[PDB]
Amino acid sequence: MMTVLEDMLRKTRNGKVHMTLIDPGAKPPQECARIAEEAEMAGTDFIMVGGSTDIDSRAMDEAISAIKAKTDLKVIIFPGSSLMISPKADAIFFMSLLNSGSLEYVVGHQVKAAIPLSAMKIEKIPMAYLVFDPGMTVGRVGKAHLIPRDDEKTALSYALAAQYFGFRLVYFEAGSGSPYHVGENVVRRVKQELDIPVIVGGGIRTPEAAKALAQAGADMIVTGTIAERSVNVYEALHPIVESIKEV
Amino acid sequence: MMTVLEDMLRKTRNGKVHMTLIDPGAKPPQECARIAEEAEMAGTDFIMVGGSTDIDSRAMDEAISAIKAKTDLKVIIFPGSSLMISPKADAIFFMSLLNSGSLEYVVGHQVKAAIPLSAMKIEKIPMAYLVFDPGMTVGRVGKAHLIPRDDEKTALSYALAAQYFGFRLVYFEAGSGSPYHVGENVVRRVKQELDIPVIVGGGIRTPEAAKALAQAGADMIVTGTIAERSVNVYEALHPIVESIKEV
Ligand SMILES: O=P(O)(O)OC[C@@H](O)CO
Numbered sequence: 134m135m136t137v138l139e140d141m142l143r144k145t146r147n148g149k150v151h152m153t154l155i156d157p158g159a160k161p162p163q164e165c166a167r168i169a170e171e172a173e174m175a176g177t178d179f180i181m182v183g184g185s186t187d188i189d190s191r192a193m194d195e196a197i198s199a200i201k202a203k204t205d206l207k208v209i210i211f212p213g214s215s216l217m218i219s220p221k222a223d224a225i226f227f228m229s230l231l232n233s234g235s236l237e238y239v240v241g242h243q244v245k246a247a248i249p250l251s252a253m254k255i256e257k258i259p260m261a262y263l264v265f266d267p268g269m270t271v272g273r274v275g276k277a278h279l280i281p282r283d284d285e286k287t288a289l290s291y292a293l294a295a296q297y298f299g300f301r302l303v304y305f306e307a308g309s310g311s312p313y314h315v316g317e318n319v320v321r322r323v324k325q326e327l328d329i330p331v332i333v334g335g336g337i338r339t340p341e342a343a344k345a346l347a348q349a350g351a352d353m354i355v356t357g358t359i360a361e362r363s364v365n366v367y368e369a370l371h372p373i374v375e376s377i378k379e380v
Numbered sequence: 381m382m383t384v385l386e387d388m389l390r391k392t393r394n395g396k397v398h399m400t401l402i403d404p405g406a407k408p409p410q411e412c413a414r415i416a417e418e419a420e421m422a423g424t425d426f427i428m429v430g431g432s433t434d435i436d437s438r439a440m441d442e443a444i445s446a447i448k449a450k451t452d453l454k455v456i457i458f459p460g461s462s463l464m465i466s467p468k469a470d471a472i473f474f475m476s477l478l479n480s481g482s483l484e485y486v487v488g489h490q491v492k493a494a495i496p497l498s499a500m501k502i503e504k505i506p507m508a509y510l511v512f513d514p515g516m517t518v519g520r521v522g523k524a525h526l527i528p529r530d531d532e533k534t535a536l537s538y539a540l541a542a543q544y545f546g547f548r549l550v551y552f553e554a555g556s557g558s559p560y561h562v563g564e565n566v567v568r569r570v571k572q573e574l575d576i577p578v579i580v581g582g583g584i585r586t587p588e589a590a591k592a593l594a595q596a597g598a599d600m601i602v603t604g605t606i607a608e609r610s611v612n613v614y615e616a617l618h619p620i621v622e623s624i625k626e627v
């Protein structure tokens with residue numbers, strides 16, 4: 134059985150990946166499952182679960198099981214400060230907010246969660262989490278020293294340090310519900326010098342933005358707000374997934 | 381040509397590694413080369429260059445070239461705060477002091493050095509740097525929240541988080557010239573749960589301590605003080621290298 138990381142590396146070697154992020158604290162459990170259902174048929178590759186609204190540990194296990202019961206896609210935990218570790222998920226982004234001003238979001242929370250994670254068979258995927266302007270809630274809670282959306286040099290420094298630290302993915306985060314996404318010149322410049330896949334999330338609502346970011350060099354595209362706030366998830370996500378595969 | 385990391389992983393799969401650390405700021409350049417010379421014939425596998433005494437960039441290039449001129453061993457930079465990056469070295473431990481109280485030693489200095497390092501063909505080896513009691517100078521300068529030498533749980537948390545972050549090596553550091561080395565129970569407990577090689581340095585002066593730590597599960601042993609402060613380096617290091625290969 135292929136791991137999620139092997140799956141991503143294979144899918145991104147000559148293609149692009151779309152991922153659907155679902156905030157379990159923003160909707161009831163079976164509403165989350167319906168979103169993941171329609172996301173799967175829109176063509177999404179993985180379901181991400183996480184967000185800013187704080188979670189009940191009893192409630193997140195419900196939403197993950199509801200998603201895995203209605204879909205056959207792998208579910209990856211997109212963790213926050215809440216120690217959102219649950220045994221019912223397939224993988225977890227073991228991430229570090231590299232440009233945070235607080236040790237707790239760079240290494241602190243991850244060290245506390247390490248031993249409990251070692252007791253689970255959940256897959257641990259090392260990922261660098263870079264928060265760009267405007268950052269929204271995650272940039273506020275994470276105490277992020279926000280990278281300007283067009284700052285190629287600062288993004289390159291963090292992305293290169295991520296690769297040299299051994300991280301297998303790097304995530305360019307503009308913040309959930311951000312009006313702007315990360316600049317394409319930043320994605321373009323980093324893709325010239327980096328050997329690990331680049332994931333872009335935050336502010337991607339339209340196929341045109343998803344395609345422009347993929348054409349800029351982004352290997353994976355994450356959409357969260359546009360999937361949780363559309364009354365028909367399929368007709369919102371399907372054109373985004375399609376425009377990404379054109380690249 | 382094999383990389384240093386591939387070399388270490390091959391040497392540690394069914395054997396142990398000894399490394400000799402040389403402080404370039406503690407001795408003149410050709411005295412450093414003589415130490416590396418006698419260390420090579422004592423049987424050491426790699427030369428490490430670095431330390432606490434602050435370095436002149438002009439002076440460290442001298443010591444590295446002097447070592448590489450007299451020895452055929454690979455030289456790895458053991459960096460401090462000084463941005464000790466030099467083009468004449470074979471590799472650099474791209475390390476993070478995970479238990480530091482300052483962001484600059486966890487991620488700060490490494491982000492600043494990332495782009496200059498990308499312009500060099502020097503090999504970047506991802507390593508987690510864990511500073512144990514008493515820590516000595518590196519624990520003071522690094523603002524380390526010192527891990528007790530027998531604290532299995534705290535060491536396991538940091539070592540596991542290192543592996544889940546993608547680090548390829550973890551370094552148990554007691555401090556240069558420390559009277560005590562890391563407890564063997566800590567090495568023993570971590571070696572049960574970890575998939576990356578464990579390197580132990582600090583306070584290892586005798587073959588008995590080097591052998592006891594290797595028998596405890598340590599994959600690599602670093603000796604610095606005993607090599608720089610012995611008038612005959614060979615007769616000090618040769619029994620240490622031999623007692624390690626018995627394991
Ligand atoms: O909700 P959006 O704006 O699509 O962002 C997705 C993800 O990057 C937020 O954590």
Ligand SMILES: O=P(O)(O)OC[C@@H](O)CO
Binds near residue numbers: 555606
């Ligand atoms: O000098 P010693 O005590 O051998 O320690 C080696 C290294 O761990 C110090 O940085």
